[PDB]
Design a protein around this ligand. Structure first.
Ligand SMILES: O=C(CO)CO
Ligand SMILES: O=C(CO)CO
Lengths: 318, 318
C-alpha cells in the first residue's frame, strides 16, 4: 500500500525530504513542523496557513515569495497545535503583521484562532480569513458551515500577490473577505484515502468525510454534469460573467482523467456563454491516495484578482 | 513497566473496565469516551469536567450524585476533543444548564471553550470555571497563567454539593469564582511519568511538565518545608485563619509516605496557629506512575464551603 517507514514519523521524514530537495524553504528549528520561505524578509504582510498532513502539496508546496510565508503541518488529517502555529506566526512576521489563512474545519479554526490570541498577547498584529468554499453539504460532522477545500490554494495566490505588492494587513483582510465569497468548490471520490466498490460519492471531504449522495459508477461526462450543475445553482450563471476554473485531483487520479474531465466541463459551460479567463489542472490539494477530483470556480469580479492569479511566484508547487 | 494491551487502546479498555466494575456510571453510546453518572436527572445544574487520561481517578472517579454529571476522557495527557465534550454537555444537561470545570492548560481550555460555543448554538445554557491552583511557576510551557491541578477535585466537591442543593447556574458560577481564588497547590516529583536520579523536582506538572527547581534528595520534612513555605507566602498566613488540606499522591508514592509527609506538614503548621478544619490524604489526581505528591490548601472563607466538602456524595473515588 504505502512507501513509508514508521507511521508516526511520516510528517517529520517528509519535511526532511522536502527541505533536502528544495533548500528554498526551511524547517523551523528541528522542533517544529513548520515550513517557511527562505525569501528575505522585507516588511511585507506575512501569510500563514496549514492544516493536517495528507493534502500535499497543500500548504508546504505553496510556501514562497508571492504566496505563503510559512505552512504549519499537523499530523495526518489533523490540525496543527496552537503552539506550532503560534511559533510560525512570530517567526513569519516581517513587521507588517500576519494574516492567517484557515480552512473551515472545527479543529483548524479552533487551533489557528487560539494561536492568533497567543500571538496577539505578544503584540503581534494578526488578521484571519476562513475559507469555506465547499458547497457539498453544510455542517459536515462538526465543521460549522462549509468545509474549506481546494479553493484555498487560489486564496493563497491572490492574497499572496497582494502581500507581495506591499498591501497593508487591513487591505489584504478586506480582499480576502471579498475573494473567499466568490470561490466555490465541489468534488467527488471514487475511493477513500487510506491513513497510515464500483461506486462514487459526491461531496466527499478531503479528510474522507462523507458526502451527500452515493451513486453507482457514472461516466466522466455524467460526473461533470453533476458538479457544473451544482456550481451553476450556486453562482447563478449569466452570460458575460467572468470565472476562473481549477480542476484538482485527489491524489490517485491520473492527469489523463483530470483532463478528460476538464474537457467535459468545457462542453457543459459553452452553453452558459460565460468567459473563462483562468484555467488550471492538477494535484494541488490532495487527500493521500484518494481517487477523485474536485471542481473549483472563482467569480472574477475584479480585474485585480486575475492579475494576482497570474502574478509572479516562487514556490515548490506553483 | 506497564500492565496494558495495545497502547492505543488504553483509554477505551480502561473505561470498559471502569463501567464493568462500577455500573453506577455509564459510558455514553460506545462511540464516546465520556463517563456519566447513572443518577436520575432531576433539574439540577449539571457539572462537566475532564482532561487527559493518566490522572485517574481524576474526573471519572468523581462522577456521581453530589459531584460531576460526566467526565470527558481524552487520550493520555491530552485534552478531550470539542466534539466529545460537546456530546457530554448535551447529554448531561438536566434543564438547568451546565457548568464546565476546566483545568488551566492551553489544550483543555481551548477545547472546552469551543465545546461550550458548540453547545450554546444548540441553545444550551453553559457557564465555565477555569481552575488555576498550581502556584509552582507561571506560564508553564504555554499554559496561560497557573496550571490546574489537584485542587480541581475540591472544586468538584464544593460545586458538586451546591448543584445538588438546587442552586442555579448563576449562583454556582459565582461560587466557583470565589472558591477557585482560595485554592492553592504546589507539588514535587521524585520521578517522571512514563507514557505508554536521586534528585527531586519542585513544581513538576501533572503532565510531567518541568518545575522551577531541581534538587538533590531531600528528607520528607525538608520537602514539606519547601511546600508549606511556598503556600505560606501565597496565602499570607495569620493566626485564626481557617483552611482545609489535601495531600495528594502522584501515583507511585505509597500511602505510608504521604502520611509521613502529612505529619511533617502538621508540624510546620502548628507554628502558624491556623485552624485546619478539613484534611484529606491519597491519590486523587495522579500522573500515571509518577513518584511524588502535592500539597493543596483551601482558605475556608465561608462556612458553606466546609459543609459542601462534607456533603453527601456517591462517586467511585469519594
Ligand atoms: O487535514 C485536515 C484539514 O487541515 C484537518 O482538519
Ligand atoms: O492531561 C492533561 C490535563 O487534562 C491534558 O492537558
Amino acid at each position: 500500500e504505502k512507501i513509508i517507514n514508521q507511521p508516526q514519523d511520516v510528517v517529520s521524514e517528509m519535511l526532511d525530504g522536502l527541505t533536502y530537495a528544495y533548500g528554498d524553504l526551511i524547517e523551523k528549528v528541528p522542533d517544529f513542523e513548520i515550513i517557511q520561505r527562505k525569501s528575505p524578509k522585507s516588511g511585507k504582510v506575512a501569510l500563514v496557513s496549514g492544516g493536517g498532513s495528507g493534502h500535499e502539496p497543500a500548504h508546504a508546496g505553496f510556501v514562497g515569495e508571492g504566496m505563503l510565508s510559512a505552512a504549519v503541518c499537523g499530523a495526518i488529517f489533523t490540525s496543527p497545535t496552537p503552539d506550532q502555529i503560534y511559533e510560525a506566526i512570530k517567526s513569519a512576521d516581517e513587521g507588517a503583521g500576519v494574516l492567517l489563512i484557515i480552512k473551515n474545519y472545527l479543529g483548524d479554526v479552533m487551533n489557528f484562532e487560539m494561536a492568533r490570541e497567543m500571538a496577539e498577547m505578544e503584540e503581534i498584529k494578526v488578521e484571519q480569513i476562513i475559507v469555506d468554499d465547499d458547497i457539498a453539504v453544510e455542517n459536515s460532522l462538526y465543521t460549522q458551515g462549509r468545509r474549506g477545500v481546494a479553493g484555498t490554494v487560489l486564496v493563497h495566490k491572490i492574497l499572496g500577490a497582494a502581500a507581495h505588492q506591499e498591501a497593508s494587513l487591513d487591505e489584504i483582510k478586506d480582499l480576502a473577505d471579498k475573494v473567499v465569497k466568490n470561490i466555490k468548490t465541489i468534488g467527488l471520490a471514487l475511493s477513500a484515502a487510506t491513513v497510515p466498490d464500483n461506486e462514487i460519492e459526491y461531496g466527499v471531504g478531503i479528510h474522507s468525510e462523507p458526502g451527500y449522495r452515493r451513486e453507482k459508477m457514472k461516466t466522466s461526462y455524467e460526473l461533470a454534469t453533476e458538479l457544473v450543475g451544482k456550481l451553476k445553482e450556486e453562482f447563478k450563471f449569466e452570460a458575460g460573467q467572468k470565472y476562473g476554473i481549477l480542476v484538482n485531483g485527489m491524489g490517485a487520479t491520473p492527469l489523463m482523467e483530470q483532463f478528460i474531465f476538464m474537457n467535459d466541463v468545457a462542453k457543459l459551460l459553452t452553453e452558459e456563454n460565460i468567459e473563462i479567463l483562468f484555467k488550471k489542472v492538477g494535484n494541488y490539494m490532495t487527500s493521500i491516495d484518494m481517487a477523485g477530483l474536485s471542481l473549483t470556480m472563482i467569480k472574477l469580479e475584479d480585474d485585480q484578482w486575475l492579475k494576482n492569479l497570474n502574478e509572479d511566484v516562487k514556490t515548490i508547487s506553483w
